[PDB]
């Protein structure tokens, strides 16, 4: 069993074709399915699994009330083959209100975080045993990706952030080998707030499109040199911009260098990836709410500032439906390494208040160089059929 | 691990012996079992699984209401070992309101179709990753087999149809190798409407008995030359005829050449297979409704037009019970390749309206050269015990 | 992978130690557990499974009403690792209201029987495919063991009976190799009614202690010569006698030669096995009802007629509790082949009528040459907590 | 496959990092989860499982009433991968109201005990078959560890006690090889009552910190020489002391030699382990009730009597929450063998009487040489949401 060194061309995609959907909320109205959020998917060298931080409970359970809160000690990381809902027989792989998992080619690494917000711990579980651990360094909610990390030749990288959301914070880059933290590089380059990175390999390095929760609606980038642990940060060039809230295509800017200062603050976990001077990217269709989800390429979006020439658009979830977080995931082909993405379809609380709980389902699409049609694949549950 | 080249005599069967039954509807009145339809079964080189397109829900769930509709974005392809009902822990292998799956001897291919009816996409998933994709070519509900496809030496064939049900349409033949579409032959021969093919290998080729939803109650045939992608079509010779609705044994014809123009239009997925100049075939016992199911051989049924000399009849489901779709599936023995078949037992809506849902159970029998008795194995659920 | 030739001394046991219990009825009052009966257990070369013919339904389901009836088309053979209840995710391995399963050392053979009582079929499923089939030969409820069969060097033997319960019948002995019936020897020796045999290997042969449902309360024996298919029958010598109903230890006889003609007719599936001139045997403690269960050795019980000198008694289920069928099962050790037994604990209908259903749980003990104490392990369910 | 000889340094830990949590009680208010108690965890050479003696029932089941009682014949030993709750599909590996399981490196040994309290039997199950058995030797509730045992080079050791709780009793040490009891050493050294040992390897021996239910609040030690079966007993030196009830840190003593005679009698299963002249130990935070749970090192705690200089404290469960039993478990790293521990979080009856049942959830932490924060991870269920 060799290690994943991911040495292969990124496949030249033509768009995304539907891959999987789990129908959790729909199934939750007549079945014992966990309450989750902040989901993601990642595959070992043979198959894909789906993760999500449950809420230590089930939907049709009085305990689901007030599940809007992100961090309680009962959130553990769930893991099932892709396509199988989070039913009672699901393995809570670790305790965590934050996470990242990846397979170096020989085993699974899971970085789980629970604890006081002011003093939390991150355990590094690999191959079943707990190899290392680390503690909060800024005393203000130690956080990580909420999606897969990446390993090249045995050394995995996962970024983490401790500090203020709506403010300045401390972002670091962990290089771990076999569960053991072997180097921590801090953030460098022009980025002003790195949160929830969506990372993918670009041999010999790792690239991430993160979330600026402070001053940018445009997305930061993080370049990790695997060879020496050096790091560089920037922003996307596309004036198209992919964060919510955002300004709006016409009055939207990005110089790839600094936060755009347009509706900047908050955001949502999202992704994007390069292809030449181009960018493949997805965002909610709504710029105020996390509603609907669309994808499209942007000619120039990578290398040329404020470019807004978009082509190959696609709606994954129509605007009249709720979406949420989104990340990317890579998958090795016989000839190239293809990129895919998942979309969190959050329901219930804060927004919908008929019910007192909050959960979600997922939808995943994968890059294809084939052909495809049109559609819309939302959660699908009728809130008036749902418990509570 | 070699590839399945299926080079072996078709076993000389004497009839069919019971193989499996899942009791889904019965179990659904006190258990969380998915709502499905358009089922089928297929085996890898070691075991058999059962597929079905669920309805993104469970029976005892308010969401099962109005599940009579064939295509919503929540239909995904379910897959379990043969004999295990579709419970919450079932893996939705892909998103699809149409499908075909087959194992080349090294891995599983699944062709799933979801999307707009006017613009749908078909994803080609193999070995876990999404290798290819294709789009609607006639803009009118891209469709496929609803049963297993077949692979000879690494190249799998699955047929698909886009166009008008009750009208003329565009039928093509896909040859895919390792998830990658490697050639598309269009329809040839005398066939007027090819829908829902039931294909089986006849080394060095593949033979299908399909569904003419336009002008024939007799069933079309499709011959696929694996060696060169050439294709020929015909109709069955048996005046016995196997589609529903149909005329009736005495006033029923078939010249094996053209649609019989007798109650022709609509139909139902069915199967049949040759043995010399003979044909083994099954159809509902009812010629108006999909009620009951019988099988029998027809001396001459293959090679001699309008032959109606049937022998070895067998009732699988008595006429006082509902049946539905039906397909075939092959299984390699130590000496020959035996053919088997499954029967969809659809319940609920449109016909039975006490309940507002629609689902089904299955029953499967396999060819035997032994002896057997008599019986009847219907769904078994008491609609007055059922939810809704 | 070699074949099981079972060439090893029967371990010199000192009694039985508790092995497994599933708690089905208890679990059925708050969980979806199948309705079953006529259970049994058997192990492959690495682990043991538990079988039972379900009733195509769940206990807390309106469909469980009137489950007292033995043969409906919905009874299928369930199979799980030993210790895991028959929950929704259980695989119905085949359709059957009668059965026997055994592992030749390379694969599992399952003989399943469904169909008309007057015309039923028995399918021979091996390694996943249906290799053979046979039909009713006396037109009066084709039956088989209801427990494991045995294979020596690749040829498995399973006995079957068609004919009258309370009368004369046709009993045959099937020798099948790889699912294919390869010889049928008919019954020979002094036995008058062979039903529900409990067979175990005694290299180079197979020995069975069956059920005389016509004229004997003492149990028939069946000797199968694997080397030539010859067969001999007898009865047990023990005047202690193990069938229910029976006369009673003091006024009970057996000459090992003919049916005792004492409360003879009906009976229940049971077992016994030899050790020198001795016999290890179990029976219900009640001689009218299937209540409680006891085991004990009988000095002389094998070779000396009407012997009633019993030692090492043990109560498995106290007399104030219900039991039922019982069979034996062998398990290969590193030095000898040990024999074990299971007990069916049937509840509900006919006897208990608060509820309208009928099901059961199991308890299994294994031979030990160690020490042990005393106890009683009944079903445990409180009928007043149970559904219906 | 070699045997586990555990030849490696105990890792130099810096404290414990969160490892797993199952959320059983929380999940039990809307899901079918077994009623258990006296849990524990142990890993084979690749993964960890969690055990617990169920109560032959489910929480939302009328049968859970009066589950406060420790020994009924329906208690069987449950086993699932670590992180997966005890749902209906759980395998009851054996019948037992007492237990210990361990993996010699080639297979699992389970010592299960059921039977009369006055006359009980202990079955030795290994590799699936029941290899040996033993009977009560003092006729007064034969008992064992309630946690993992340890095997060095093929010979596993498990200690057991028969006799009076609140009195003098007979404690023995079993050395079993492949399920076969191969030597029984009786207790030696200064210990006055050994119950519920928490054992761990210290090559070439095994060390246990047990429970004195008679005259000590300080914990006994048991030294097992694997090389010759010799045995020595003592008490911990720490004046800090780890049993509940206990006196209180300031007025607490221990000379490592004799029971402290301070609130001595009853107790609770707990653990501790040495590191030089130091001791890592955990106890409830409450000295009257089993409430909350804390851990800390004690400088001198191993080798110097009445030492109370504690450092590196950590609260696992805050004092305002219930805890219970606790044991240790070892896990082999690539360089050293690390020790971990689990905590039973018992709820319901005797203490909380809103509900009539009694069950629990678990929390497990593992030794780390990294860093960590602060927190509290209790059961989490709201008793007013719970059934009954
Ligand atoms: C593959 O498949 C696409 C599917 O496209 C998308 O369609 C829907 C909207 O985006 C959406 O549910 C789904 O998620 C797909 O992303 C094929 O074409 C698609 O066709 C539809 C229908 O023609 C287009 O939808 C438009 O937007 C509104 C909602 O869909 C609708 O109100 C519009 O109404 C009027 O326009 C249509 C032309 O689109 C015309 O037929 C009528 O005159 C209609 O009349 C109205 O006039 C006023 C408002 O429009 C009102 O006062 C009056 O009441 C009435 O509403 C319009 O239909 C959709 O935008 C288009 N999508 C794409 C992607 O092209 C597409 O053919 C093919 N493309 C590819 C790349 O594969
Ligand atoms: C293996 O096992 C078969 C089983 O055959 C099938 O039987 C049932 C009908 O097909 C069905 O449930 C099951 O699915 C099987 O496919 C053995 O024989 C079978 O026997 C039955 C009973 O004799 C035959 O059934 C006939 O059809 C009606 C329903 O089953 C029934 O109404 C008929 O009634 C009269 O006929 C019987 C002769 O069949 C006779 O005993 C009586 O006189 C009875 O009297 C009536 O007279 C009028 C109508 O018939 C009425 O006015 C009056 O009220 C009363 O109803 C009839 O019984 C079945 O057709 C036959 N099947 C097969 C396959 O041969 C078979 O022996 C063996 N064969 C093989 C190849 O293995
Ligand atoms: C290992 O463990 C056994 C357990 O044996 C079995 O005990 C119970 C009955 O068989 C049963 O639940 C369980 O399934 C076991 O198979 C050890 O000994 C056992 O001890 C019990 C108690 O002494 C014996 O039971 C007898 O039968 C009745 C029910 O158990 C009970 O009513 C009897 O009552 C009188 O007898 C006892 C002596 O047994 C005496 O202590 C009292 O004087 C008591 O007084 C009565 O007098 C009249 C009726 O007896 C009434 O008018 C008045 O109200 C009152 O009831 C009796 O207790 C059981 O038979 C015996 N079993 C075995 C197997 O020996 C055993 O020590 C050890 N053996 C082995 C091989 O391991
Ligand atoms: C890593 O993270 C720890 C977390 O420590 C623990 O905190 C809580 C108590 O132990 C517990 O939920 C959790 O399980 C952890 O084990 C970091 O520090 C921790 O900080 C807290 C808050 O400062 C400490 O808690 C103390 O105890 C009570 C409950 O937590 C609380 O009532 C106390 O109140 C007063 O003290 C604080 C100082 O601790 C001060 O800010 C206020 O003045 C407050 O005012 C009160 O005055 C009177 C009573 O105190 C009342 O009349 C009036 O109403 C009001 O209550 C106090 O806060 C906790 O002990 C401390 N824990 C540790 C482990 O140090 C820690 O910084 C870091 N350490 C390590 C090794 O990683
Ligand atoms: C990933 O794996 C390859 C495996 O060797 C690393 O490249 C090796 O580089 C040395 C010089 O550093 C050559 O001798 C090896 O033989 C190289 N590979 C090959 C295929 O020849 C590579 O640097 C690793 N590190 C990273 C970040 O990708
Ligand atoms: C299926 O597999 C066989 C495997 O070789 C293909 O047949 C081969 O044909 C060539 C000439 O085309 C011979 O040299 C090979 O050695 C043949 N097989 C054997 C066993 O000798 C066959 O044509 C393949 N294609 C199809 C449709 O079946
Ligand atoms: C079970 O297996 C053995 C395997 O060979 C069979 O015994 C063989 O008998 C022949 C003569 O028939 C010897 O040459 C073989 O080498 C024998 N075995 C051994 C170990 O030498 C045996 O007869 C088989 N049949 C039955 C009923 O047990
Ligand atoms: C304990 O177990 C290990 C693993 O079986 C034994 O393995 C060998 O011993 C050393 C290093 O452990 C070398 O002699 C071999 O090449 C090792 N093989 C492996 C896999 O490590 C070791 O002999 C046993 N040690 C003791 C002290 O009993
Ligand atoms: C555990 O395993 C080792 C494996 O051999 C045992 O140690 C062996 O001791 C003999 C003398 O008794 C040496 O020749 C072996 O080669 C030793 N091991 C090594 C690695 O050399 C050891 O005693 C066993 N027993 C216990 C309690 O640990
Ligand atoms: C880690 C964590 O729980 N912080 C957090 C996160 N990650 C997400 C959200 C949110 O976008 O709703 C809100 C949050 O407070
Ligand atoms: C693919 C699809 O959903 N079309 C379709 C199919 N396949 C079957 C039926 C039907 O026979 O009820 C009806 C239909 O409309
Ligand atoms: C095979 C079958 O269903 N016959 C049968 C059997 N096997 C058992 C019993 C019974 O003992 O209740 C009763 C029966 O009628
Ligand atoms: C073995 C057993 O059931 N005895 C026992 C045990 N082990 C524990 C407790 C208890 O601490 O509640 C109480 C008990 O009576
Ligand atoms: Ca922002
Ligand atoms: Ca038609
Ligand atoms: Ca009888
Ligand atoms: Ca004590």
CSV table of C-alpha atoms in Angstrom, one decimal, chain C residues 15-285:
chain,number,residue,atom,x,y,z
C,15,UNK,CA,-22.5,-31.2,30.7
C,16,UNK,CA,-23.6,-27.9,29.0
C,17,UNK,CA,-22.6,-24.3,29.8
C,18,UNK,CA,-24.6,-21.3,28.6
C,19,UNK,CA,-23.7,-20.1,25.1
C,20,UNK,CA,-26.0,-17.4,23.7
C,21,UNK,CA,-29.6,-16.0,24.1
C,22,UNK,CA,-31.2,-13.4,21.8
C,23,UNK,CA,-34.1,-11.9,23.8
C,24,UNK,CA,-36.4,-11.5,20.9
C,25,UNK,CA,-39.8,-11.4,22.5
C,26,UNK,CA,-38.6,-9.0,25.2
C,27,UNK,CA,-37.0,-6.8,22.5
C,28,UNK,CA,-40.2,-7.0,20.4
C,29,UNK,CA,-42.2,-4.8,22.7
C,30,UNK,CA,-40.2,-1.8,21.7
C,31,UNK,CA,-38.4,-2.6,18.5
C,32,UNK,CA,-39.0,-4.0,15.0
C,33,UNK,CA,-38.2,-7.7,15.4
C,34,UNK,CA,-39.5,-10.4,13.0
C,35,UNK,CA,-42.1,-13.0,14.0
C,36,UNK,CA,-40.5,-16.4,13.6
C,37,UNK,CA,-40.6,-20.1,14.7
C,38,UNK,CA,-38.9,-23.4,14.0
C,39,UNK,CA,-35.5,-21.8,14.6
C,40,UNK,CA,-32.0,-23.5,14.7
C,41,UNK,CA,-28.3,-22.6,14.6
C,42,UNK,CA,-25.3,-23.8,12.6
C,43,UNK,CA,-21.7,-22.5,12.1
C,44,UNK,CA,-19.4,-22.2,9.2
C,45,UNK,CA,-15.7,-22.9,9.9
C,46,UNK,CA,-15.3,-19.5,11.7
C,47,UNK,CA,-18.6,-18.4,13.2
C,48,UNK,CA,-22.2,-19.4,14.1
C,49,UNK,CA,-25.5,-18.0,12.7
C,50,UNK,CA,-29.0,-18.5,13.8
C,51,UNK,CA,-31.8,-19.3,11.4
C,52,UNK,CA,-35.6,-19.2,11.7
C,53,UNK,CA,-38.5,-19.2,9.4
C,54,UNK,CA,-40.1,-15.7,9.8
C,55,UNK,CA,-43.7,-15.1,9.1
C,56,UNK,CA,-43.2,-12.3,6.5
C,57,UNK,CA,-43.9,-9.7,9.2
C,58,UNK,CA,-43.0,-8.0,12.5
C,59,UNK,CA,-44.6,-8.5,15.9
C,60,UNK,CA,-45.8,-4.9,16.4
C,61,UNK,CA,-47.6,-5.1,13.1
C,62,UNK,CA,-51.3,-5.9,12.5
C,63,UNK,CA,-50.0,-8.6,10.1
C,64,UNK,CA,-48.8,-10.7,13.0
C,65,UNK,CA,-52.4,-11.7,13.8
C,66,UNK,CA,-53.1,-15.4,13.2
C,67,UNK,CA,-49.4,-16.3,12.9
C,68,UNK,CA,-50.1,-19.7,14.5
C,69,UNK,CA,-50.3,-21.3,11.0
C,70,UNK,CA,-47.2,-23.0,9.9
C,71,UNK,CA,-47.3,-22.5,6.1
C,72,UNK,CA,-48.0,-19.3,4.2
C,73,UNK,CA,-46.1,-18.2,1.1
C,74,UNK,CA,-44.5,-15.3,3.1
C,75,UNK,CA,-42.3,-17.5,5.3
C,76,UNK,CA,-38.7,-17.1,4.2
C,77,UNK,CA,-35.5,-18.3,5.9
C,78,UNK,CA,-33.8,-15.6,8.0
C,79,UNK,CA,-30.0,-15.7,8.9
C,80,UNK,CA,-27.9,-13.6,11.3
C,81,UNK,CA,-24.7,-14.1,13.3
C,82,UNK,CA,-25.4,-15.9,16.6
C,83,UNK,CA,-26.5,-13.3,19.1
C,84,UNK,CA,-28.1,-10.8,16.8
C,85,UNK,CA,-32.0,-10.7,16.8
C,86,UNK,CA,-34.0,-10.7,13.7
C,87,UNK,CA,-34.3,-7.0,13.1
C,88,UNK,CA,-35.3,-5.2,9.8
C,89,UNK,CA,-31.8,-5.5,8.4
C,90,UNK,CA,-32.0,-9.3,8.4
C,91,UNK,CA,-31.5,-11.2,5.2
C,92,UNK,CA,-34.3,-13.5,4.2
C,93,UNK,CA,-31.9,-16.0,2.5
C,94,UNK,CA,-34.7,-17.9,0.6
C,95,UNK,CA,-38.5,-18.6,0.5
C,96,UNK,CA,-39.4,-21.5,2.9
C,97,UNK,CA,-41.8,-23.0,5.4
C,98,UNK,CA,-39.3,-25.8,6.0
C,99,UNK,CA,-35.5,-25.9,5.9
C,100,UNK,CA,-32.0,-27.2,6.6
C,101,UNK,CA,-28.6,-25.4,6.1
C,102,UNK,CA,-25.1,-26.6,6.4
C,103,UNK,CA,-21.6,-25.5,5.4
C,104,UNK,CA,-19.5,-28.1,3.6
C,105,UNK,CA,-16.4,-26.2,4.5
C,106,UNK,CA,-16.4,-24.2,1.3
C,107,UNK,CA,-20.0,-22.8,1.2
C,108,UNK,CA,-23.5,-22.8,2.6
C,109,UNK,CA,-26.3,-25.1,1.4
C,110,UNK,CA,-29.9,-24.2,2.2
C,111,UNK,CA,-32.8,-26.4,1.4
C,112,UNK,CA,-35.9,-24.4,1.3
C,113,UNK,CA,-39.5,-25.6,0.8
C,114,UNK,CA,-42.6,-23.5,-0.1
C,115,UNK,CA,-45.6,-24.2,-2.3
C,116,UNK,CA,-48.9,-26.0,-2.2
C,117,UNK,CA,-49.1,-28.5,0.7
C,118,UNK,CA,-50.3,-31.0,-1.9
C,119,UNK,CA,-47.6,-29.9,-4.4
C,120,UNK,CA,-44.6,-28.1,-3.0
C,121,UNK,CA,-41.1,-27.7,-4.3
C,122,UNK,CA,-37.7,-27.8,-2.6
C,123,UNK,CA,-34.9,-25.6,-4.0
C,124,UNK,CA,-31.3,-26.4,-3.4
C,125,UNK,CA,-29.4,-23.1,-3.0
C,126,UNK,CA,-25.6,-23.3,-2.7
C,127,UNK,CA,-23.0,-20.6,-2.9
C,128,UNK,CA,-25.7,-18.1,-3.8
C,129,UNK,CA,-27.1,-19.7,-6.9
C,130,UNK,CA,-30.0,-22.1,-7.2
C,131,UNK,CA,-28.3,-25.3,-8.3
C,132,UNK,CA,-31.2,-27.9,-8.1
C,133,UNK,CA,-34.8,-28.4,-7.2
C,134,UNK,CA,-37.1,-31.3,-6.4
C,135,UNK,CA,-40.8,-31.7,-6.1
C,136,UNK,CA,-43.3,-33.3,-3.7
C,137,UNK,CA,-43.3,-37.1,-4.1
C,138,UNK,CA,-46.2,-38.1,-2.0
C,139,UNK,CA,-48.3,-35.0,-2.6
C,140,UNK,CA,-48.6,-34.4,1.2
C,141,UNK,CA,-46.5,-31.7,2.7
C,142,UNK,CA,-42.9,-32.2,1.7
C,143,UNK,CA,-40.8,-31.6,4.8
C,144,UNK,CA,-37.3,-31.4,6.1
C,145,UNK,CA,-35.2,-31.2,9.3
C,146,UNK,CA,-35.8,-27.7,10.7
C,147,UNK,CA,-32.1,-27.8,11.7
C,148,UNK,CA,-28.6,-28.2,10.3
C,149,UNK,CA,-27.6,-30.9,7.9
C,150,UNK,CA,-24.1,-32.4,7.7
C,151,UNK,CA,-21.4,-32.6,5.0
C,152,UNK,CA,-18.5,-35.0,5.0
C,153,UNK,CA,-15.9,-34.3,2.4
C,154,UNK,CA,-18.1,-32.4,0.0
C,155,UNK,CA,-21.3,-34.5,0.1
C,156,UNK,CA,-24.1,-33.2,2.3
C,157,UNK,CA,-27.0,-35.2,3.6
C,158,UNK,CA,-30.4,-33.9,4.4
C,159,UNK,CA,-33.5,-36.1,5.0
C,160,UNK,CA,-37.0,-35.3,4.1
C,161,UNK,CA,-40.5,-36.6,4.6
C,162,UNK,CA,-43.7,-36.4,2.5
C,163,UNK,CA,-46.8,-38.2,3.7
C,164,UNK,CA,-49.1,-38.4,6.7
C,165,UNK,CA,-48.1,-36.9,10.1
C,166,UNK,CA,-50.5,-39.1,12.2
C,167,UNK,CA,-50.0,-41.9,9.8
C,168,UNK,CA,-47.6,-43.8,7.5
C,169,UNK,CA,-45.3,-41.7,5.3
C,170,UNK,CA,-42.4,-41.6,2.7
C,171,UNK,CA,-39.0,-40.7,4.1
C,172,UNK,CA,-36.0,-40.3,1.9
C,173,UNK,CA,-32.3,-39.4,2.3
C,174,UNK,CA,-30.7,-36.9,0.0
C,175,UNK,CA,-27.0,-36.8,-0.8
C,176,UNK,CA,-26.1,-33.6,-2.6
C,177,UNK,CA,-22.8,-32.3,-3.7
C,178,UNK,CA,-22.4,-28.6,-4.4
C,179,UNK,CA,-26.2,-28.0,-4.4
C,180,UNK,CA,-26.8,-30.8,-6.9
C,181,UNK,CA,-28.8,-33.8,-5.6
C,182,UNK,CA,-26.5,-36.8,-6.3
C,183,UNK,CA,-28.4,-39.8,-4.8
C,184,UNK,CA,-31.6,-40.4,-2.9
C,185,UNK,CA,-31.6,-43.4,-0.5
C,186,UNK,CA,-35.0,-44.3,1.0
C,187,UNK,CA,-35.6,-45.2,4.7
C,188,UNK,CA,-34.5,-48.6,6.0
C,189,UNK,CA,-34.3,-50.3,9.5
C,190,UNK,CA,-37.1,-50.5,12.1
C,191,UNK,CA,-38.3,-46.9,12.3
C,192,UNK,CA,-42.1,-46.1,11.8
C,193,UNK,CA,-42.2,-42.4,11.3
C,194,UNK,CA,-39.2,-40.1,10.8
C,195,UNK,CA,-39.8,-36.4,11.1
C,196,UNK,CA,-37.7,-33.4,12.0
C,197,UNK,CA,-34.3,-35.1,12.3
C,198,UNK,CA,-31.5,-33.7,14.5
C,199,UNK,CA,-28.4,-34.9,12.7
C,200,UNK,CA,-24.7,-34.9,13.7
C,201,UNK,CA,-21.6,-36.4,12.2
C,202,UNK,CA,-20.0,-39.5,13.6
C,203,UNK,CA,-17.3,-40.0,11.0
C,204,UNK,CA,-17.5,-41.7,8.6
C,205,UNK,CA,-21.2,-41.4,8.9
C,206,UNK,CA,-24.1,-39.2,10.0
C,207,UNK,CA,-26.5,-40.0,12.9
C,208,UNK,CA,-30.0,-38.5,13.5
C,209,UNK,CA,-32.4,-38.7,16.4
C,210,UNK,CA,-35.8,-37.8,14.9
C,211,UNK,CA,-39.5,-37.4,15.7
C,212,UNK,CA,-42.1,-40.2,15.5
C,213,UNK,CA,-45.4,-38.3,15.2
C,214,UNK,CA,-47.3,-41.6,14.8
C,215,UNK,CA,-46.8,-44.3,17.4
C,216,UNK,CA,-43.8,-43.5,19.5
C,217,UNK,CA,-42.8,-41.2,22.4
C,218,UNK,CA,-39.4,-42.8,22.1
C,219,UNK,CA,-37.1,-41.3,19.4
C,220,UNK,CA,-36.1,-42.9,16.1
C,221,UNK,CA,-32.5,-43.1,15.0
C,222,UNK,CA,-31.3,-42.9,11.4
C,223,UNK,CA,-27.9,-44.1,10.3
C,224,UNK,CA,-26.5,-42.8,7.0
C,225,UNK,CA,-23.5,-44.5,5.5
C,226,UNK,CA,-21.7,-41.8,3.7
C,227,UNK,CA,-19.5,-44.3,2.0
C,228,UNK,CA,-22.3,-46.1,0.1
C,229,UNK,CA,-25.6,-44.4,0.8
C,230,UNK,CA,-26.9,-47.4,2.8
C,231,UNK,CA,-29.3,-46.5,5.7
C,232,UNK,CA,-30.4,-48.2,8.9
C,233,UNK,CA,-33.1,-47.1,11.5
C,234,UNK,CA,-33.8,-48.0,15.1
C,235,UNK,CA,-35.1,-46.3,18.3
C,236,UNK,CA,-33.3,-45.2,21.4
C,237,UNK,CA,-32.8,-47.7,24.2
C,238,UNK,CA,-33.4,-45.4,27.1
C,239,UNK,CA,-36.7,-46.2,28.9
C,240,UNK,CA,-36.3,-42.5,29.9
C,241,UNK,CA,-37.6,-41.4,26.6
C,242,UNK,CA,-37.6,-37.9,25.1
C,243,UNK,CA,-40.7,-36.9,23.3
C,244,UNK,CA,-43.7,-34.8,24.4
C,245,UNK,CA,-46.3,-36.1,25.1
C,246,UNK,CA,-44.9,-39.1,26.8
C,247,UNK,CA,-46.0,-41.6,29.4
C,248,UNK,CA,-43.7,-41.0,32.4
C,249,UNK,CA,-40.3,-42.3,33.6
C,250,UNK,CA,-41.6,-45.1,35.7
C,251,UNK,CA,-44.2,-46.4,33.2
C,252,UNK,CA,-42.1,-45.7,30.1
C,253,UNK,CA,-40.5,-48.2,27.9
C,254,UNK,CA,-38.2,-48.5,24.9
C,255,UNK,CA,-36.6,-51.6,23.4
C,256,UNK,CA,-34.7,-49.6,20.9
C,257,UNK,CA,-36.4,-51.7,18.3
C,258,UNK,CA,-40.0,-50.6,17.8
C,259,UNK,CA,-42.3,-47.6,18.6
C,260,UNK,CA,-43.3,-47.8,22.3
C,261,UNK,CA,-47.0,-47.3,21.6
C,262,UNK,CA,-47.2,-45.0,24.7
C,263,UNK,CA,-48.9,-41.6,23.9
C,264,UNK,CA,-47.0,-42.3,20.7
C,265,UNK,CA,-48.6,-40.0,18.0
C,266,UNK,CA,-47.7,-36.3,18.0
C,267,UNK,CA,-44.3,-35.1,19.3
C,268,UNK,CA,-41.9,-32.3,19.0
C,269,UNK,CA,-38.5,-31.8,17.4
C,270,UNK,CA,-35.8,-33.0,19.8
C,271,UNK,CA,-32.3,-34.4,19.9
C,272,UNK,CA,-30.0,-36.8,21.7
C,273,UNK,CA,-26.4,-38.2,21.1
C,274,UNK,CA,-24.4,-41.2,22.1
C,275,UNK,CA,-21.2,-41.5,24.2
C,276,UNK,CA,-20.2,-45.2,24.5
C,277,UNK,CA,-23.2,-47.0,25.8
C,278,UNK,CA,-24.6,-43.7,27.1
C,279,UNK,CA,-26.8,-41.0,25.9
C,280,UNK,CA,-26.9,-37.3,26.4
C,281,UNK,CA,-30.4,-36.1,26.0
C,282,UNK,CA,-32.8,-33.2,26.5
C,283,UNK,CA,-36.6,-33.0,26.7
C,284,UNK,CA,-39.2,-30.6,28.1
C,285,UNK,CA,-39.7,-31.2,31.8
